[PDB]
Amino acid sequence: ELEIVWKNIKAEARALADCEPMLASFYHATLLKHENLGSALSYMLANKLASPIMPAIAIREVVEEAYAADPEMIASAACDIQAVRTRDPAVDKYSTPLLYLKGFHALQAYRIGHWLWNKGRRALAIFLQNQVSVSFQVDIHPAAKIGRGIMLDHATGIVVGETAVIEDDVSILQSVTLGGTGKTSGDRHPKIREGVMIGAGAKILGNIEVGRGAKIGAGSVVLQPVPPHTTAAGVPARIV
Amino acid sequence: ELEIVWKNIKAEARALADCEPMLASFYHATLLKHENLGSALSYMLANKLASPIMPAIAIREVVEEAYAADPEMIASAACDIQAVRTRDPAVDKYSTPLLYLKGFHALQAYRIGHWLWNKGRRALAIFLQNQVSVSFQVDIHPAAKIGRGIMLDHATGIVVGETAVIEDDVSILQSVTLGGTGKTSGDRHPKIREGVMIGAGAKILGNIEVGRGAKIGAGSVVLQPVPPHTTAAGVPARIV
Amino acid sequence: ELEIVWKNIKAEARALADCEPMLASFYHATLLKHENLGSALSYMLANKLASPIMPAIAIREVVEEAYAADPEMIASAACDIQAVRTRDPAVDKYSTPLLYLKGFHALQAYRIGHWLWNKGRRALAIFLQNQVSVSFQVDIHPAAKIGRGIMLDHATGIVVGETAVIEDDVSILQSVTLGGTGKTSGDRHPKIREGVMIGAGAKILGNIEVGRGAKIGAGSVVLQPVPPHTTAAGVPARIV
Amino acid sequence: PPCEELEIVWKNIKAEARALADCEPMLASFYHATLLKHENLGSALSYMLANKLASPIMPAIAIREVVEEAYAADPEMIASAACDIQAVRTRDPAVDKYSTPLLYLKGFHALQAYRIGHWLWNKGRRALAIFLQNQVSVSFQVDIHPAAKIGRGIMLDHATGIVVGETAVIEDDVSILQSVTLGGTGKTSGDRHPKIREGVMIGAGAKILGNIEVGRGAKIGAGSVVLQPVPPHTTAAGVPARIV
Amino acid sequence: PPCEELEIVWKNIKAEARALADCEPMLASFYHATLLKHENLGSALSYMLANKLASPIMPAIAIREVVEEAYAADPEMIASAACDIQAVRTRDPAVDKYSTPLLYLKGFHALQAYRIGHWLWNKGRRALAIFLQNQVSVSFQVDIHPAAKIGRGIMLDHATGIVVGETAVIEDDVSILQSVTLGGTGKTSGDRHPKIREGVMIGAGAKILGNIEVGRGAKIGAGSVVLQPVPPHTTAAGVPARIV
Amino acid sequence: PPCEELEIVWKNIKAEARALADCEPMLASFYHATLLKHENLGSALSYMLANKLASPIMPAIAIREVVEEAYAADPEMIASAACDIQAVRTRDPAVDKYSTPLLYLKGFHALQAYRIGHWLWNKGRRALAIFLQNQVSVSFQVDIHPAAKIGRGIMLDHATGIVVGETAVIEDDVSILQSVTLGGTGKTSGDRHPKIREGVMIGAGAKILGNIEVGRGAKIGAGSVVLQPVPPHTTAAGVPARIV
Ligand SMILES: CC(C)(COP(=O)(O)OP(=O)(O)OC[C@H]1O[C@@H](n2cnc3c(N)ncnc32)[C@H](O)[C@@H]1OP(=O)(O)O)[C@@H](O)C(=O)NCCC(=O)NCCS
Ligand SMILES: CC(C)(COP(=O)(O)OP(=O)(O)OC[C@H]1O[C@@H](n2cnc3c(N)ncnc32)[C@H](O)[C@@H]1OP(=O)(O)O)[C@@H](O)C(=O)NCCC(=O)NCCS
Ligand SMILES: CC(C)(COP(=O)(O)OP(=O)(O)OC[C@H]1O[C@@H](n2cnc3c(N)ncnc32)[C@H](O)[C@@H]1OP(=O)(O)O)[C@@H](O)C(=O)NCCC(=O)NCCS
Ligand SMILES: CC(C)(COP(=O)(O)OP(=O)(O)OC[C@H]1O[C@@H](n2cnc3c(N)ncnc32)[C@H](O)[C@@H]1OP(=O)(O)O)[C@@H](O)C(=O)NCCC(=O)NCCS
Ligand SMILES: CC(C)(COP(=O)(O)OP(=O)(O)OC[C@H]1O[C@@H](n2cnc3c(N)ncnc32)[C@H](O)[C@@H]1OP(=O)(O)O)[C@@H](O)C(=O)NCCC(=O)NCCS
Ligand SMILES: CC(C)(COP(=O)(O)OP(=O)(O)OC[C@H]1O[C@@H](n2cnc3c(N)ncnc32)[C@H](O)[C@@H]1OP(=O)(O)O)[C@@H](O)C(=O)NCCC(=O)NCCS
């Protein structure tokens, strides 16, 4: 499931190097000279999170440290790759999210932040949170809880709050907010449940819920819970 | 029409250098020491698309190669400059889009991607597509088809799909999606027609159409076609 | 009020350095080795606005020049820090906006642009305007007029026009447009008044007004004025 | 001749590049961008100088324009470069490829950079010539005043420490090693620097001082301090140098 | 021995690092990233070489893989480095910390960079060895052909201008100063560079030319041009050098 | 005097800058940012050092604070710099503008960088002084231990290869060329480096070894190895040097 995603990635690379020599050595460094996904992702993230304050080479040690202490972060990433390839038809390659998709990079960055937050290294997770915000336009609070098989497609704009929850197999799109409402300190953010699909510009406020296999439509503002397998829409959101 | 836009640009530059000496040599390098627009644009794009993987100097050869094989990309750009200057009143100078406007830079980048896609160099057009996505927050699939006299104003957020079409003299604004809907592989993206104007946060889904001289209002979600010279609005969109 | 914000910032720093040694010398350079906020902000902005065309060290002289000729820009910034800390609960530290929040950085950048615009150095303010647009996804025209105690939370997407006005103690959020409407050259942009709160994706068009203690809801398009202490919503906006 | 070298050299570099790309994948794109995507030496050289001279003050993209202006105005600079490449290939036993100077050797780069600066100097663009001379000094540790007159088929391996003064002459086919100084006594102004004639070999650490001539085909011993003229086809060595 | 040095040195560097971090807050994160976050010298060395050899063509992250591959394949390179560090500490009176070579001294960096290039050269990855040799030349002003054979406990302070040819030998415990040339006469090909035996001290500016031997424990005077063999436990000085 | 030089020099640099900006548009903003936007030499010098010493570990913006702290604490460093500029202008026949040292010459930059490091060294901030010394070595190829005592009106053209040891003294108005070594014999510790008195001219490649004195107004021949004291107003040349 993993080793199988990787094998594919390596294959695509070999063929990609053969037909675009301007990026050959990019493909070779990022993919072809790694043994597994853990390696390629560490390399990729290090470059994506690089700054004057922390160069790639120092970030890589942190990502490797996280992946060593929680190997499942690599499995989650594999599922997030499988996801975007089947769900996005414009994506016709496993390598593509790993190489190029800022939603994917932002997502995996978040997991690093999540691991750091939970260990107690909060100061650094906040630096990383805002790094990803400026680099990739995705502002996920690392205290948030996010599962596997997730897709953030065209991700420019996404925001997700401290107490929020997203569960396996969700698909989000641009400008999607999983926000607060007004006043209620403590818990205050959505609990998006399995297999959901949120559309463009979808604001979704308060400590509510969106149950299984649902559908938020583009433009929607969602103040009221959505039951399993339903479909909400409009401003505010009401079932259709 | 072209030579006339350029002449203006050069003039503005001379006066800009004279009254802001901190940017004089910027103006001199970007504009004043070029003979024509082709040159200035190649320079400008090279810098805008620069990365560790491909520095300005290597990108410039690709843009020059494209402009040599299709000189009309330069004419399109001239019309996209004329456009933004007359349509945006905050823009009081021809040089401004060329120098500073990320919608303009993103647009011209797309044309390079479009030329590469069509020639068969898909691997590189995808790298460029996502480059522009991270650099400028505009995610235009290069297989899309876009015409001349276009304005992308304040462009932070724009997304446009593989099968989409935009035609001469359109004006788009921030957060505008020309997206898909749900399920229908093959053709699935809007055909925006001549002289249209799309407003802020305008989601527009499916393989529909928006005819001539139309008007999408800010916030609109557009599932249903709009006839020529009409005006849609709201969630969903209905004529007013 | 100021000296008190600073004292806090310095304290947080000392403790932050002690528990995250990877950023110690970052904290030390940005904060701990400054005497006051003016200094720390000059340092911070210089780094944030740095480009090949203008490195940090040359930008810092401009920011210092502005802060010398208008010391109140520092007081405004202090109030914008106090603001975000009390209003955002995820923010539990005074240092955080100064260090990390792109809405805050963008805001203070704008003030520099505003000072330059008003002095007559328009060419440079436009360079800075678009710098901030690409760096931080906030596109505030510098001719706009913005007061103190402002918060731009998760700011990815904000746009604000030439003739616009925002007054003390406002809170804006992502994707918020304070835009024009159609045709009316001269004055054409909102006058947001004291203590207002604008929500996610809130488009707000024309030379209208939003009076005191108001509330624009997420997703709202606002064509019609809002009286003091009201609350608007939906597409278009009508009181509730 | 120089113009025939233009093509024999480029031909060879291109071939080398294909084989290099196949055998070293980490550099494949480097070899492609610098060499394989170009159709002549001039285009590769401008590419290479631009990256090598790049700085925050003046980036590659901008330097390339300057370098290409100069090549258009005086394409003998490219033919000289061809001869300089040929010189390194045949004379330095450690260099077995034509590409090596062009890609790697700082002496070769400094040498071609001096050519751009000399062209600028004679066009009256002295402010820029001085900027580039000192850039070259810092980046490659070769210091050549742009008013110096230097010919072709020059080998500057391994160039670290070379200093060449304003009024020095170096003619075709000279080989200079590290730490050569072509300078003044300290006593005069105006014409005060040596005149090195052709085919001269100058050994490491040699200091040649004054407006003195070193005649064709002579050899200067490593470590020498040469204060008097050196006849043609002669070896001078010592501190100060005697004819040996 | 080398393997015991691996640990005695690292132990000391770590201690030094804690004290350095406390006393200089502007560098605290530098010391933390380079030294304190690592558990052995090898891991610190790869970190340090990667940053030092980094370029647009090949960034730190990528070089580290190469360096770590080489260390896995031949960990004696790390033990040599340990000895080289020890050498600098005990021999250069201006160096009072083990960390100083590792952090700062370009001679030490060039030396360990040559080791990576030599390993690559003997694996047949010559294109990359040449890229790195010339990188080292530009960044640190030391030029060592990767086919040279160099041992351990080598001090290259203060290394600017050192040139070492393809067929040179430098054995353990040699001390070389600035502007040393280990080169050819100009007359031969093939085996043509000096053989420096152990414990030899070579003074600044010395040129040692030809396939000649300098015997164990000898001393070469600054400024010397050595053309003839130098017996063990002997001092040679002059231009050309005589046994003094 | 030094303080009068502060103003006569700056006056001239500003004038030069206006004329340079007008005649070379590619550098106009460079000249504006470095020179025209400043009101005194100190402010320009800190600007220039900060860019020149910048690195990933420590960027311009941060170095400028350090440099400005030092200038506030001891403004004689700026007056020395003024004298050093004046020295280059009058003594190097190739330099015809006051701006040239400040903008371009690495010897001048290394020299002022040593001043910052020396100030740090005497304040007990040695970790940072060593970081900067070795930065200076790599960037400008001048190696000056920060404990060295160096005065003013010093010309270090064209500085590549200069090495100056911990216990060396160089007094006012000394002129040093490339590849000068002010070092030890190898035999002693503690006080072991030369004492160069004022107005001394040291020629290229000279090695001056031991705690020996070179007396005021003497001249050291290029290539020399000086092992014995040199009386005032005397010329020493040779390997080893004799009074000539
Ligand atoms: C709502 C959506 C998810 C499909 O849900 P569905 O369960 O198939 O619903 P249907 O398409 O059958 O639509 C049913 C009703 O809801 C309406 N509707 C559909 N999408 C809507 C939206 N975004 N907002 C408001 N109403 C909507 C339809 O017009 C129809 O109304 P009617 O019955 O009164 O005429 C889909 O329309 C959508 O919005 N997808 C978003 C994908 C996206 O974000 N794309 C961006 C491009 S990358
Ligand atoms: C719709 C728009 C394009 C103007 O169209 P128009 O053909 O002139 O329509 P009108 O202004 O006459 O408005 C007609 C009706 O539509 C409504 N309407 C206008 N804009 C609307 C919007 N964005 N959403 C929903 N309804 C809207 C009006 O309130 C009016 O309603 P009523 O007759 O029931 O009272 C304009 O209002 C708009 O939205 N422009 C967007 C520009 C933008 O994106 N600016 C961002 C700043 S950079
Ligand atoms: C509107 C808002 C500001 C609260 O205002 P309020 O004065 O407390 O109004 P209430 O919550 O009492 O809601 C009153 C009515 O307006 C409706 N309403 C609330 N928010 C709305 C929105 N964004 N759009 C449309 N209608 C909305 C409610 O459903 C209710 O309708 P009903 O009475 O017909 O059932 C709040 O709902 C909101 O939108 N906050 C935005 C915060 C944000 O942008 N968060 C992003 C996360 S960082
Ligand atoms: C001078 C040199 C070129 C040889 O020239 P040559 O004409 O072949 O001279 P010969 O070898 O016959 O030597 C002639 C005499 O000069 C002496 N001599 C040779 N080279 C000398 C030098 N560099 N300095 C001083 N004396 C030297 C010899 O000892 C001999 O003296 P003798 O007649 O008293 O025995 C060679 O010795 C040399 O200096 N090569 C420099 C190579 C170099 O700089 N670097 C390559 C390494 S990167
Ligand atoms: C050669 C050297 C190592 C000393 O070796 P030694 O065996 O102790 O020699 P001595 O000092 O006894 O000197 C012996 C003779 O050689 C001469 N001599 C010493 N060093 C010499 C040199 N470098 N060049 C020429 N002659 C030299 C002495 O004048 C003396 O001559 P004499 O017998 O006619 O009086 C030392 O002089 C030297 O050259 N050190 C180099 C240090 C250096 O390069 N740099 C450190 C600064 S970064
Ligand atoms: C030594 C020097 C400064 C001249 O000093 P001077 O007092 O004018 O000496 P003179 O020229 O009268 O020469 C005196 C004797 O010393 C010899 N001599 C001069 N310079 C010498 C040197 N560098 N090495 C060895 N011998 C030298 C002369 O051959 C002469 O010998 P003689 O009496 O047997 O004929 C000059 O020759 C010199 O070395 N200048 C260095 C310039 C430099 O390093 N670089 C500039 C280029 S970047």
Author numbering:
A (entry chain B), B (entry chain B), C (entry chain B): 5 to 244
D (entry chain A), E (entry chain A), F (entry chain A): 1 to 244
Show passages lifted from the paper.
Serine O-acetyltransferase (CysE) is an enzyme in many bacteria that catalyzes the first step in l-cysteine biosynthesis by transferring an acetyl group from acetyl coenzyme A (acetyl-CoA) to l-serine to form O-acetylserine. Lack of the CysE/CysK-dependent l-cysteine biosynthesis pathway in mammals suggests that those bacterial enzymes may become targets for antimicrobial agents. In this study, we used recombinant CysE cloned from Salmonella Typhimurium (StCysE). Here, we demonstrated that alkyl gallates such as octyl gallate (OGA) could act as potent CysE inhibitors in vitro and in bacteria.
We determined the crystal structure of a complex of StCysE and CoA. Two subunits of the StCysE-CoA complex were in an asymmetric unit: one subunit formed a trimer that was related to a crystallographic three-fold axis, and the other subunit also formed a trimer that was related to the same crystallographic three-fold axis; together they formed a hexamer (B: residues: 1–245). The CoA molecule bound to a hydrophobic crevice located between β-helices at three equidistant active site locations related to a three-fold axis near a cysteine-binding site. The di-phosphate portion of CoA interacted with the side chain of Lys-187 via electrostatic interaction and formed a hydrogen bond to the side chain of Thr-235. The pantothenic group of CoA interacted with the main chain of Thr-185 and Ala-222. The adenine group of CoA was fit in the hydrophobic pocket of the StCysE. There was no electron density in the C-terminal region of StCysE (residues: 245-C-terminus), so the hydrophobic region of StCysE was exposed to the solvent.
